[PDB]
Design a protein around this ligand. Sequence first.
Ligand code: WP8
Length: 135
Amino acid sequence: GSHMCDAFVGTWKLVSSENFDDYMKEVGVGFATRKVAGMAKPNMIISVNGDVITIKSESTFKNTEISFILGQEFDEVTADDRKVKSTITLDGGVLVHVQKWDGKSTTIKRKREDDKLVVECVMKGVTSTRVYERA
Ligand SMILES: Cc1cc(S(=O)(=O)Nc2ccnn2C)c(C)cc1Cl
């Protein structure tokens, strides 16, 4: 029957980005990776099978894929090649994705707003907002 993340499931395309270069700088991404990653217009493909959620992020820069159970830490290699320990939870209908590495932390929130999927990436005081629409 109907379930936890139904409104997230599907194929989404990036339509706007703000402050992503600054977010990446704060994370520690180097110049060349920032330039090429920042150009990209990824799709995000979200699916659910039982308790397992899969998020694929695909662009001309990189294809990534994570599968996880809410609340259960996992290893992730990010598109910029960080090796992080991640935990994703649902907080009042928002997917909250925390990545920990080298004593640092970043949080990515994904939420449904109208017909969009809005992604907010936060590293210390710097936020990037990335808006997706259905493909
Ligand atoms: C590097 C990077 C990538 C992302 S992403 O948007 O999920 N994926 C992305 C960007 C460009 N191509 N692809 C697949 C995010 C949220 C953060 C960071 Cl630092």
